[PDB]
Amino acid sequence: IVEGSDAEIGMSPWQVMLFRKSPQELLCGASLISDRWVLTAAHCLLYPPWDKNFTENDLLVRIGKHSRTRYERNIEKISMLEKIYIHPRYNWRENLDRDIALMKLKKPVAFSDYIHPVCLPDRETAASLLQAGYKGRVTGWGNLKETGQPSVLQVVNLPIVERPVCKDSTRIRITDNMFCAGYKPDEGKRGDACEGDSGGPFVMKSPFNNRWYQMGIVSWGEGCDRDGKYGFYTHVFRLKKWIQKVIDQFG
Amino acid sequence: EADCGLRPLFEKKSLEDKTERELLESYI
Amino acid sequence: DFEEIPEEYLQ
Ligand SMILES: NC(=[NH2+])c1cc2cc(-c3cccc(-c4ccccc4)c3O)[nH]c2cc1Cl
Ligand code: NA
């Protein structure tokens, strides 16, 4: 996260960390949506361009963290995966369209003041909150600059941008399954996700029922906090039927 | 999940974090 | 940089 600050304890209790066993390194960010499901970006698991194709056995999910590198003994929980599901039309060949994937934990986790799932949005909440100018929050333990790793979870609040601007900022083809967010060069405010933050959650707080919803997933950007550029996120609501389906089909 | 999105240390105790204001304030 | 995590989580 660039130009973001340190989070507070229990500020994003649904923030998960995908950890690799060997070598032991941070891979991506993810979020907890029930006591057995974690959601992330599919490129965090499969990205053939760079021979990336992890399997159940190769990852660890760490929930309840604040610190990036410490094993916060008695606060975080580490789970193993039972199954990983990548969206069937995930497009890694062109624009990372439908960048989403679900992970089933071996055993359910218990919630605590530090572990609590986030809400997935419903047509109405999507409709009322995904509006340009509205801010969302992104969190992660990713890099602090483009080219500088934090010791604690970082947070930054970014505005959603109007699609035409998003499109006119890159040469990549944008689809309706993505939205972009960030400040205009003109707004003298910055912030952005960066390497290491991928897979994590973009959330908004409903002013109707005070709950936090996860509207997008950190998917991609060109550089970190470059002016005239933005971050793109998977549109969770547009792919929610898929979600429901693997869940009530497999658990 | 019924109970989803309500944080034990904030919503559940009626405590706000330092920047949520910024967000609610952007919603209008 | 990461600190060691309990052996039981690898197996
Ligand atoms: N808004 C941004 N500027 C942004 C930047 C990056 C950069 C990455 C990223 C960079 C290098 C490697 C990976 C990566 C590749 C395979 C697996 C895991 C991570 C990234 O996710 N992800 C990103 C997501 C975002 Cl919103
Ligand atoms: Na920018």
Phi, psi of A175 (to 5 degrees): -120, 180
CB-closest option in A78, A80, A149 to C5? A78
| Residue A151 vs residues A118, A146, A148, A154: alpha-carbon distances, Å | 24, 17, 10, 9
Method by which this entry was solved: X-ray
- Select from A109, A114, A110, A96 the least CA-distant residue to A10: A114
Ligand 1 probe mutation, A197, A222, A226, A234, most atoms within 8 A of CB: A197
CB-closest option in A113, A119, A137 to B5? A119
Q: How many CA atoms lie within 13 A of A242 on its CB side?
A: 19
Q: Under an 8 A CB cutoff, do C9 and A24 touch?
A: no
Where would I find the H helices in A74-232? 123-129, 163-167
Q: Across the strands, what pairs with A5?
A: A155
Q: Are A175 and A238 in contact (CB under 8 A)?
A: no
Distance of alpha carbon B5 from alpha carbon A104, whole angstroms: 20
Q: Across the strands, what pairs with A83?
A: A104
User: Which residues in chain C have their CB less than 8 angstroms from residue A68's CB?
Assistant: 2
- Select from A123, A119, A152 the least CA-distant residue to A1: A152
Strand duo A154-159 + A59-63: pairing: unpaired
Domains of chain B: 1-28 (4.10.140.10)
Out of A12, A87, A99, A169, pick the active-site residue.
A99
Buried-exposed string A185-204: b where 16+ CB fall within 10 A, e elsewhere: eeeeebbbbbbbbbbbbbbb
Q: Which two tokens stand for residue A66?
A: 């604040």
Q: Which two tokens stand for residue A191?
A: 């912030």
Residue of chain A minimizing CA distance to C3: A70
Resolution of this deposited model, Å: 1.8
Residue B11 alpha carbon to ligand 1 centre in Å: 31
Q: Under an 8 A CB cutoff, do A71 and C5 touch?
A: yes
Cα A106 from chain centroid (whole Å): 21
Cβ-in-10-Å burial (0-12, 13-18, 19+) of A112 comes to middle
Phi, psi of A96 (to 5 degrees): 55, 45
Phi, psi of A59 (to 5 degrees): -120, 165
Buried-exposed string A26-38: b where 16+ CB fall within 10 A, e elsewhere: bbbbbbbbbebbb
Q: Which residues contact A69 (CB under 8 A, 6 or more apart)?
A: A151, C1, C2, C3
Neighbours of A86 (CB within 10 A): 20
- Select from A11, A108, A26 the least CA-distant residue to A64: A11
The secondary structure element, H or E, covering residue A179 is strand A178-181
Distance of alpha carbon A81 from alpha carbon A71, whole angstroms: 19
Domains of chain A: 1-12+118-237 (2.40.10.10), 13-117+238-250 (2.40.10.10)
The secondary structure element, H or E, covering residue A204 is strand A201-205
Is the Cα dihedral A70, A112, A5, A21 positive or negative?
A: positive
| Residue A212 vs residues A32, A39, A73, A99, A154: alpha-carbon distances, Å | 13, 16, 27, 21, 17
